[PDB]
Short mmCIF file of C-alpha atoms (C1' of nucleotides) in Angstrom, two decimals:
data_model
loop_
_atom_site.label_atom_id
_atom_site.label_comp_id
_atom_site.label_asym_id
_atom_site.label_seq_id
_atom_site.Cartn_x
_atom_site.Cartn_y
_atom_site.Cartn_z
CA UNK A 1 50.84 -15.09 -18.71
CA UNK A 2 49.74 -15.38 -14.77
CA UNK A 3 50.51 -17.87 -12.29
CA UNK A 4 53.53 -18.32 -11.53
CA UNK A 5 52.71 -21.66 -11.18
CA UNK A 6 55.15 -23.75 -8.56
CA UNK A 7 55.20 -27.24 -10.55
CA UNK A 8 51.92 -30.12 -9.57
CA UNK A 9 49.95 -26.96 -8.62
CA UNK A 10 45.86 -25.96 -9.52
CA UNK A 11 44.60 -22.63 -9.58
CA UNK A 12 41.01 -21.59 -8.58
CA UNK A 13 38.60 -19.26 -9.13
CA UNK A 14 35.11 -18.31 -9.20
CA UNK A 15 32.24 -17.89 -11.99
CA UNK A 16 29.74 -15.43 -11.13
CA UNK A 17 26.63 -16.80 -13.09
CA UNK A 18 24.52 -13.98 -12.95
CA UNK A 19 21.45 -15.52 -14.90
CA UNK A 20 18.27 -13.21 -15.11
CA UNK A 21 15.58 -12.40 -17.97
CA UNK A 22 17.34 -10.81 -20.59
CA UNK A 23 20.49 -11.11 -20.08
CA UNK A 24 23.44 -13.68 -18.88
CA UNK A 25 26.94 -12.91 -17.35
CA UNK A 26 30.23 -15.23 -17.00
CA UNK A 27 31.99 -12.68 -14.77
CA UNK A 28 34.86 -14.67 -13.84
CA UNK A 29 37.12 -13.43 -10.69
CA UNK A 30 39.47 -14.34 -8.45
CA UNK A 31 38.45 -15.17 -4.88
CA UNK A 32 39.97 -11.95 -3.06
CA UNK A 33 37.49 -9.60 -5.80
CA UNK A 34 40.18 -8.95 -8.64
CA UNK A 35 38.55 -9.43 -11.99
CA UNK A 36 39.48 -11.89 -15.40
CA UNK A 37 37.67 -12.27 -18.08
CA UNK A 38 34.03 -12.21 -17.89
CA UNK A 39 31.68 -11.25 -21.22
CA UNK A 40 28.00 -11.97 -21.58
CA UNK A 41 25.14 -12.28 -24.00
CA UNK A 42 24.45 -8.94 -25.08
CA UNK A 43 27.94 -7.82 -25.86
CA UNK A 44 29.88 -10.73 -27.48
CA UNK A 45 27.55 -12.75 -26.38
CA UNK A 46 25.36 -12.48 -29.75
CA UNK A 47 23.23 -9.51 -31.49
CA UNK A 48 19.11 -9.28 -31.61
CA UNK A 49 17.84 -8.50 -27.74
CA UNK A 50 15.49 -11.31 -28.88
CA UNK A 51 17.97 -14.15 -28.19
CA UNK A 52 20.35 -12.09 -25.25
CA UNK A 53 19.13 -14.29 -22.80
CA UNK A 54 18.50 -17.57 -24.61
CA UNK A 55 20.72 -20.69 -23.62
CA UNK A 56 22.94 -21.31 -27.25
CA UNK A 57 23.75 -17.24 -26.42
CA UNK A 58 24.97 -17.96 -22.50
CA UNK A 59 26.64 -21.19 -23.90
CA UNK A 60 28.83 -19.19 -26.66
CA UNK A 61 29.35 -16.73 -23.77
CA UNK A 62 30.47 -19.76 -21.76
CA UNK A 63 33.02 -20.60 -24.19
CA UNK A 64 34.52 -17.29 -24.88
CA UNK A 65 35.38 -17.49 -21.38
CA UNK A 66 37.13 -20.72 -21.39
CA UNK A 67 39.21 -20.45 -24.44
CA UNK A 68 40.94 -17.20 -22.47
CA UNK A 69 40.98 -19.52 -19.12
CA UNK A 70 43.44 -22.14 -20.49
CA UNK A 71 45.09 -19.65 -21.98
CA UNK A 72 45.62 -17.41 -18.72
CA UNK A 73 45.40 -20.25 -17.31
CA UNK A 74 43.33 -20.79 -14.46
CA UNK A 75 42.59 -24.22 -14.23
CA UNK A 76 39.03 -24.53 -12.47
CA UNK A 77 36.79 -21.90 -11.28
CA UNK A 78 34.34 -22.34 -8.24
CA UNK A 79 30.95 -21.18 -9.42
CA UNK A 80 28.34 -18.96 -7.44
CA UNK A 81 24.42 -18.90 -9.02
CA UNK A 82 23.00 -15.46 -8.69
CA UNK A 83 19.47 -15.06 -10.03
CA UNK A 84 18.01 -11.50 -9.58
CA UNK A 85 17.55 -9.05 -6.67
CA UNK A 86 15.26 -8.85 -3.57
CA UNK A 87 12.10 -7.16 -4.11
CA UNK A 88 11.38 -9.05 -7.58
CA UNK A 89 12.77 -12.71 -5.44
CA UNK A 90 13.59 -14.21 -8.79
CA UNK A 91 16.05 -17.06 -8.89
CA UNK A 92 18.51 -17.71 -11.79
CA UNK A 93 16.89 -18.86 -15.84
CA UNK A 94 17.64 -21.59 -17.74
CA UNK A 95 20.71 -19.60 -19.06
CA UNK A 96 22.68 -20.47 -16.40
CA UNK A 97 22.77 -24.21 -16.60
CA UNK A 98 23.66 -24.18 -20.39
CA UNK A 99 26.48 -21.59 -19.16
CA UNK A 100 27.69 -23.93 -16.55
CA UNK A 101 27.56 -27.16 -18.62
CA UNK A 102 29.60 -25.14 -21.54
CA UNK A 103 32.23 -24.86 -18.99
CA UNK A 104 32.35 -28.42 -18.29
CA UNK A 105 32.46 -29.20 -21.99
CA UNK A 106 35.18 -26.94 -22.53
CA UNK A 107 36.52 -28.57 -20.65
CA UNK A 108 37.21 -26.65 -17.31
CA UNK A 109 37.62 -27.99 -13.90
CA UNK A 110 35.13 -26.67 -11.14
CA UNK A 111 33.73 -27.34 -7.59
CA UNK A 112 31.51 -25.94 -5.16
CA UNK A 113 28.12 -24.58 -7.11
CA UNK A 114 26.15 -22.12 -4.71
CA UNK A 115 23.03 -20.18 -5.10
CA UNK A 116 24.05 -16.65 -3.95
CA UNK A 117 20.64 -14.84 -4.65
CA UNK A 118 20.10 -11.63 -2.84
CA UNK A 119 17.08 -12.56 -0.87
CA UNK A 120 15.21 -10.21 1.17
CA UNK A 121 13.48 -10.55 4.72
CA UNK A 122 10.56 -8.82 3.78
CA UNK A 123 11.56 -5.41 2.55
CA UNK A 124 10.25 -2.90 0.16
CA UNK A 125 7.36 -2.79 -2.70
CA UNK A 126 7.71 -4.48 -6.02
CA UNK A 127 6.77 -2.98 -9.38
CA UNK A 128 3.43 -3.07 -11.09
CA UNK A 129 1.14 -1.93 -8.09
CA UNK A 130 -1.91 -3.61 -6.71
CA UNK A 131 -3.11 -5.41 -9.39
CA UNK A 132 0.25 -5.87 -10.93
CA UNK A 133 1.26 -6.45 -14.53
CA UNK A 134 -1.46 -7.56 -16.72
CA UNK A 135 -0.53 -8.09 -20.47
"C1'" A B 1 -33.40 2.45 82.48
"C1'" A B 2 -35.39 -2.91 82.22
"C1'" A B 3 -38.28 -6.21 79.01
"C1'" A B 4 -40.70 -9.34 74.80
"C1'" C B 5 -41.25 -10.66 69.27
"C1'" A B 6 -37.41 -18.63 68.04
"C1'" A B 7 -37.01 -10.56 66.90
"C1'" G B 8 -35.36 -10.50 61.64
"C1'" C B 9 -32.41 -9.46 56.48
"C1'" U B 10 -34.35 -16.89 52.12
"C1'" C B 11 -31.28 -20.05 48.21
"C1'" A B 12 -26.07 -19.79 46.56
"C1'" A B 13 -29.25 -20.46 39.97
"C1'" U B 14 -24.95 -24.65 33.79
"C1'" G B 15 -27.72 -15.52 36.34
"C1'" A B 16 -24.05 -11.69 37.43
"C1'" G B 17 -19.99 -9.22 39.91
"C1'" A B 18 -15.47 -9.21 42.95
"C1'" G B 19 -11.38 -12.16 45.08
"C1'" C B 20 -7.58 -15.94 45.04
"C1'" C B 21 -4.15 -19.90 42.21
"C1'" A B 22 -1.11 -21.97 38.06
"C1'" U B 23 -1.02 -21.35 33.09
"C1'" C B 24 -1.83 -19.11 28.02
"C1'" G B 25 -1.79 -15.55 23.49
"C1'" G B 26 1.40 -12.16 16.68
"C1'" G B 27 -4.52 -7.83 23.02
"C1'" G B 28 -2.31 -2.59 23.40
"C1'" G B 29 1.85 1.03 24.52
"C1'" U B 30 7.00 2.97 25.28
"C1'" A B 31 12.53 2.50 24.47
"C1'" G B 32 16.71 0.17 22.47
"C1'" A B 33 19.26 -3.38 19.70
"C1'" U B 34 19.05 -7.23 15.28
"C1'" C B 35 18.74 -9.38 10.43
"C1'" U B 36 19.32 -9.67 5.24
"C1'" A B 37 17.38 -6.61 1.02
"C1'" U B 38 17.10 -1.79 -1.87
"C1'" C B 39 19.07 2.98 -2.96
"C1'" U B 40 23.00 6.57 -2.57
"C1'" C B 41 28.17 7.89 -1.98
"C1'" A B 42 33.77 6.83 -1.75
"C1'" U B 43 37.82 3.49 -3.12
"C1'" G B 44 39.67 -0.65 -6.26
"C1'" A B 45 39.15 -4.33 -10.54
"C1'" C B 46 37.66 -4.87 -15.68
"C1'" G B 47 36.65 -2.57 -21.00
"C1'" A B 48 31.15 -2.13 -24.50
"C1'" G B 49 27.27 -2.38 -23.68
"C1'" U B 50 23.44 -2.54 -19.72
"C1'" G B 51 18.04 -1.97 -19.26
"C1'" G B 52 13.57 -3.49 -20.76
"C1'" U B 53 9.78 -6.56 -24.27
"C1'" G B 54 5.19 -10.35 -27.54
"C1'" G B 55 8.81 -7.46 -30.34
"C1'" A B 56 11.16 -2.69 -29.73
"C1'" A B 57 12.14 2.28 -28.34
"C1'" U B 58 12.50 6.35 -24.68
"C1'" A B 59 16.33 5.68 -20.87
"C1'" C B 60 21.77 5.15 -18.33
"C1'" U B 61 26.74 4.29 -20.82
"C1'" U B 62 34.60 4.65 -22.45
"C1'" U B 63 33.86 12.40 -18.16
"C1'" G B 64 33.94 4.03 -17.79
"C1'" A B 65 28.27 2.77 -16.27
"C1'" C B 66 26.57 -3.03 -16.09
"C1'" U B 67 28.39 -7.04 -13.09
"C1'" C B 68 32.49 -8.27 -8.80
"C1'" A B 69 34.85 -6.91 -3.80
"C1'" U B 70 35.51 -4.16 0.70
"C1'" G B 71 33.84 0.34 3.65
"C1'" A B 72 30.33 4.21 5.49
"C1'" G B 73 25.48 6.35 5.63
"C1'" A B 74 19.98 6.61 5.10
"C1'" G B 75 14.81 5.56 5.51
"C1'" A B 76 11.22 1.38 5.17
"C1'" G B 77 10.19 -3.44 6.40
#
RNA sequence: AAAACAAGCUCAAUGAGAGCCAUCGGGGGUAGAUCUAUCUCAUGACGAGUGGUGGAAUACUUUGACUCAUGAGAGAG
């Protein structure tokens, strides 16, 4: 129970793909900043650490989602790529287009992908050093 | 005082210096704005993990972290 829906009306809202190394998020919200539903790997999302991050995981997270969606029901949700922060300038893993497609699947109407990746200009040191990691 | 020596001190170097003219460039210095990013703090939303790895653990977590949204501050770039 939600909406309030007038009659021949959609609903909207937005994703929040946050795909990075380890880990995926669904983080589903309304436009304004009020939070639904979101989930992600690591919690329902699977078990392991191993396969957090891997994209069957993001695409069972990506359902888990959408079965609550209908049943709130949205209707479509606008969907933002975010990959990882500034100093590391990492854009989003393969997680996230497995995520997204499980959506579609669902089935769940959408619109309007962006890449929303904090990138810096310039700006601070990353980890490692010098030389950097070396494994 | 009045003479004479054509009295005399070369050239203007693809040597050099100085001048003048219109440009050019992340040459240097001082002062103030600007742009995201990161971290911290305050408020709201959610409700079990988040991190991190070849794989894990130490680590931070319902005294509510992690992500999402607004707002203020800081120092570096």
């Amino acid at each position: 129970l939600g909406p309030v829906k007038r009659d021949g009306e959609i609903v909207m809202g937005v994703a929040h793909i946050y795909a990075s190394k380890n880990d995926t998020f669904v983080h589903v919200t309304d436009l304004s900043g009020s939070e639904t539903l979101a989930r992600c790997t690591g919690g329902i999302a699977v078990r392991a650490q191993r396969d957090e991050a891997t994209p069957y995981a993001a695409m069972l997270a990506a359902q888990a989602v959408a079965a609550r969606l209908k049943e709130l029901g949205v209707d479509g949700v606008h969907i933002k790529f975010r990959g990882e922060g500034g100093s590391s300038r990492r854009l989003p893993a393969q997680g996230a287009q497995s995520a997204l497609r499980a959506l579609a699947r669902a089935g769940v109407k959408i619109g309007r992908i962006e890449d929303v990746t904090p990138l810096p200009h310039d700006s601070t040191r990353r980890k490692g050093g010098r030389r950097g990691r070396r494994l």
